[PDB]
Ligand SMILES: NC(=O)c1ccc[n+]([C@@H]2O[C@H](COP(=O)([O-])OP(=O)(O)OC[C@H]3O[C@@H](n4cnc5c(N)ncnc54)[C@H](O)[C@@H]3O)[C@@H](O)[C@H]2O)c1
């Protein structure tokens with residue numbers, strides 16, 4: 019008795035049918051009523067074609083490009099009878115161009131990342147996010163288009179809101195539950211949240227040993243590698259007193275971010291999750307690092323920022339992905355082959371994904387999901403635990419967009435977090451909040467001299483591994 | 486067609502330590518030397534070791550050798566007679582130097598695979614200097630072989646064989662050095678700027694990596710101990726840059742520096758034939774100093790005018806790479822550890838060789854590609870890592886029996902051709918391979934880097950920063 023939330027009265031166009039598309043389609047078929055013959059999947063690959071053929075859904079085997087996207091998508095988006103829904107789960111395509119095409123033709127839109135069509139300041143996820151904010155300022159309101167609504171970016175934005183609420187109660191901080199951005203930002207400031215890690219540990223383990231010269235991951239290899247080779251990026255908090263010599267800022271935009279002139283997936287930070295305890299994460303650039311820091315910014319009269327939390331990814335991927343990164347960076351080039359772990363090839367593990375709020379009176383608080391592969395297989399087909407946290411987030415954003423179809427261009431930080439979590443929670447396994455006394459200065463200084471800041475344990479000076 | 490018996494041992498054989506290396510060495514000692522079986526006795530404090538020794542039918546004393554008991558224990562055991570005994574030290578937590586000097590005082594031959602203290606001045610440079618000082622204070626005497634495992638040990642022989650091969654491959658004939666100075670000049674004359682001990686262990690386990698367990702193919706305690714020490718290397722005369730946290734030594738042979746950071750968290754760019762380009766870890770090792778020292782050329786005023794860089798570039802097995810990521814990421818040793826047994830290894834090799842670079846053919850790798858499959862067919866109770874070590878101990882023991890009045894010697898002092906003659910049946914494919922790879926391959930990339938394009942093998946380019 020799965021809930022059928024709404025009818026979709028027009029076409030459903032899924033761009034891309036990889037690990038996430040394969041996990042999202044069965045949720046779309048499960049939770050929405052629609053004209054089955056109006057669903058169409060667009061993907062250039064033959065692996066995708068035969069999978070889509072098995073489910074008997076329309077398949078167009080093409081790569082969407084700058085040259086063909088208009089003539090290819092417009093007739094599909096406007097086929098009626100009612101409002102269609104564009105579900106973009108691809109690599110190598112312009113999120114912004116397809117988003118704007120969907121809007122000007124009255125189709126709803128959702129994606130999980132801002133990327134361009136197939137100089138570090140440009141190409142950064144900060145600049146790409148800025149193109150979306152600019153589009154929203156150019157065409158306020160209108161048809162809803164949800165930008166970056168997967169597990170992270172996406173779900174973690176809702177975890178941050180629930181975490182702040184939990185910290186307010188546990189810290190005896192009194193007041194209404196915020197309902198505006200300005201009020202959320204001030205609540206973060208009042209609780210004394212210096213920064214936030216997106217703190218993730220994937221423990222899914224494969225049934226086969228790691229093959230030589232093969233990159234292995236639990237989701238897009240092409241996407242992860244592309245993101246990991248880009249400069250490390252973070253939302254930059256007002257409490258930070260030090261940045262590295264190779265750090266750089268942005269001349270325009272919301273002003274919430276810096277980047278480092280080194281690749282994110284070869285940049286380690288000291289972080290913590292409940293199952294891993296103290297661990298290394300990689301500082302891989304991500305939309306929510308900027309969007310969450312921007313969302314929680316408090317400005318004064320003259321528009322200057324007086325409070326902003328640090329925010330960045332601290333990603334420990336699966337063991338095979340750690341080995342794949344060691345191999346790739348040590349060889350100096352991409353492996354000649356890659357594979358994504360299928361649920362049939364995973365013997366055990368979880369995708370532990372949450373937000374670690376630190377700097378407040380209880381030191382540090384981690385809130386998020388501990389979804390296991392065994393739980394995943396029980397409640398959803400064709401995906402591993404990583405995929406289901408992403409695919410269920412897309413499902414939640416689609417429900418929200420159907421109930422709020424004229425909200426304009428919106429980020430995950432703009433959605434009603436309680437409604438989105440109500441949709442997603444049946445697919446998240448244990449969702450828990452845990453306090454810890456761990457700090458980045460645990461056990462330090464040790465035998466060797468280090469350039470640490472002992473006045474404040476959570477300074478980025480102390481978090482960043484400086485090899 | 487049967488195994489060669491190289492020598493009779495006419496006195497007690499005392500094996501100190503029965504971990505992964507001792508377990509692999511005991512069957513080779515039994516196989517290749519003649520002696521009354523009751524002359525051999527193993528000393529180790531571990532219950533696990535005791536049960537295995539019982540199953541192999543050897544005498545076993547369950548005791549830790551310490552500063553307080555080693556004289557009471559080892560002197561009676563090593564002098565039981567009727568002739569000269571052999572102390573085979575394959576332990577952790579014991580003083581190599583103190584046991585070595587005790588064996589020599591009592592006329593027993595000695596061999597070990599590392600210089601360790603009893604459970605600047607704790608560096609492998611300084612530990613090596615105490616052995617050199619012992620040799621100066623007592624020249625001659627009964628042979629004691631220091632640091633004769635796979636690395637340090639065998640790799641010193643590979644360096645010699647590689648220098649001769651480089652000369653031959655250039656058309657230089659009649660190049661057979663006999664003295665230390667002649668070996669150093671050969672390296673200088675061929676233009677060898679440096680040497681990596683370049684290793685890639687591809688042995689894979691039949692079980693996934695357990696959380697909060699350190700996994701390795703040889704000593705976990707020994708590997709973590711070394712890996713947490715400052716990175717150390719022999720420092721070449723061609724080097725024009727060193728990190729800000731590098732430090733030298735006020736005394737000793739002068740061949741070394743160290744970095745104020747743990748070696749097992751220090752990455753260097755390197756290369757092996759099976760790995761191609763890879764990261765290695767710059768773990769401190771005796772041979773990094775001893776080989777650079779051995780190959781040093783001095784002017785009349787006694788200052789070094791030529792010396793090669795030399796250091797470890799170790800890519801351990803996949804589970805050990807994960808184990809180091811976990812250990813350094815948590816800031817503490819895992820609650821448990823295990824060494825992979827040959828029955829737990831599904832496939833792989835231990836590719837261990839020397840990478841000589843800077844000469845006219847850019848880079849030359851020489852060494853062993855021993856597989857776990859071959860290991861099982863030719864020697865019991867060990868994986869491929871263990872067999873490279875145990876067979877090197879075998880070779881050093883043969884040399885010591887054949888040269889019993891040579892005093893304290895390093896692997897660099899032994900007859901390398903004789904030692905490789907004994908060891909090679911256990912090394913699988915032993916190959917030399919040239920490559921055009923350099924540390925500047927593919928660089929600069931997208932990001933600014935402080936590199937030296939005039940000299941791609943500078944440590945400035947090798948060290949990952
Ligand atoms: N926000 C999050 O939490 C999150 C999580 C995982 C993935 N993602 C993103 O979602 C996307 C999908 O990831 P995945 O694991 O499914 O990747 P994947 O590599 O498994 O699949 C990508 C698919 O896109 C297809 N494709 C390539 N070029 C195309 C084009 N020009 N037009 C249409 N399709 C094309 C490929 O054939 C492939 O089937 C990626 O962009 C990734 O960055 C976001």
Ligand SMILES: NC(=O)c1ccc[n+]([C@@H]2O[C@H](COP(=O)([O-])OP(=O)(O)OC[C@H]3O[C@@H](n4cnc5c(N)ncnc54)[C@H](O)[C@@H]3O)[C@@H](O)[C@H]2O)c1
Nearest residue numbers: 503504505506531549550576577598634635636637704707
């Ligand atoms: N040169 C090389 O190539 C090379 C290679 C591998 C190992 N090693 C060295 O060889 C030694 C043994 O390696 P391993 O893999 O067998 O290690 P291991 O950790 O498997 O075994 C060490 C053994 O020493 C025993 N021991 C501990 N304290 C003792 C004491 N006080 N007296 C006697 N025995 C004691 C332990 O019970 C254990 O059985 C280490 O010192 C290691 O660094 C050298």
